Ligand binder design. Structure first.
Ligand SMILES: NCc1ccccc1
Ligand SMILES: [Ca+2]
Length: 222
């Protein structure tokens, strides 16, 4: 996260760290057995770390659970990063408590201008911001028009832009797969962009609201 502030500890209880030796992507707990992340973060097996604030220090609130199934959206495309969403089933249910709580799936698509929170342990591009501690940032959803203007012909129905066209505040590598929460619901998954915090290049997020049927279906047949 670039240009944000350190999240208050456990203020984003749905935030998870996907670990394969080291943290490599974020994700969001949607229920006791399932985590939503970005399909480009795919690995056949991953360790989900919940209840984290500082990923390099034991705080006593962590729950480390290995995955049972990792399911990329059937139409994920590595050529253009389209339908960049994936589900991870936990091998054991997570224990919900003060440090671990799921985030609600969207009841509808958030309109342009809606203020959201994005968080993660990714590149901060700053000497003061310690990326080991969960970072937070408030970003507004941009209109499709603004999004297409920034990335002509690269925005599909499964993507939306959020952030500031003026730059300075944005998600970045390592935040990938993480949550974008607006009005208490998961509206986006950190997906891609050109650089981080560069003017004219806002972040691009997977549009969760159009995947509700795939998500709910998948979270019952598996
Ligand atoms: N600045 C958006 C972004 C997110 C994840 C990875 C690269 C870029
Ligand atoms: Ca920790």
């Amino acid at each position: 996260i670039v240009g944000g502030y350190e999240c208050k500890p456990y203020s984003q209880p749905h935030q998870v760290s996907l670990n394969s030796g080291y943290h490599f992507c974020g994700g969001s707990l949607v229920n006791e057995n399932w985590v939503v992340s970005a399909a480009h973060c795919y690995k056949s097996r991953v360790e989900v770390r919940l209840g984290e604030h500082n990923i390099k220090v034991t705080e006593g609130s962590e729950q480390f659970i290995s995955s049972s199934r990792v399911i990329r959206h059937p139409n994920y495309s590595s050529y253009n990063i389209d339908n960049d969403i994936m589900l991870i089933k936990l091998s054991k249910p997570a224990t919900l408590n003060t440090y671990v709580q799921p985030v609600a799936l969207p009841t509808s698509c958030a309109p342009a201008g809606t203020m959201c929170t994005v968080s993660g342990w990714g590149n901060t591009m700053s000497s003061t911001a310690d990326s080991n501690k969960l970072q937070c940032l408030n970003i507004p959803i941009l209109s499709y028009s603004d999004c297409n203007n920034s990335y002509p012909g690269m925005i599909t129905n499964a993507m939306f832009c959020a952030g500031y066209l003026e730059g300075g505040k944005d998600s970045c590598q390592g935040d990938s797969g993480g949550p974008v929460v607006c009005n208490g619901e998961l509206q986006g998954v950190v997906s891609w962009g050109y650089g981080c915090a560069e003017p004219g290049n806002p972040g691009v997020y997977a549009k969760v609201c159009i995947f509700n049927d795939w998500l709910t279906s998948t979270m019952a047949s598996y």
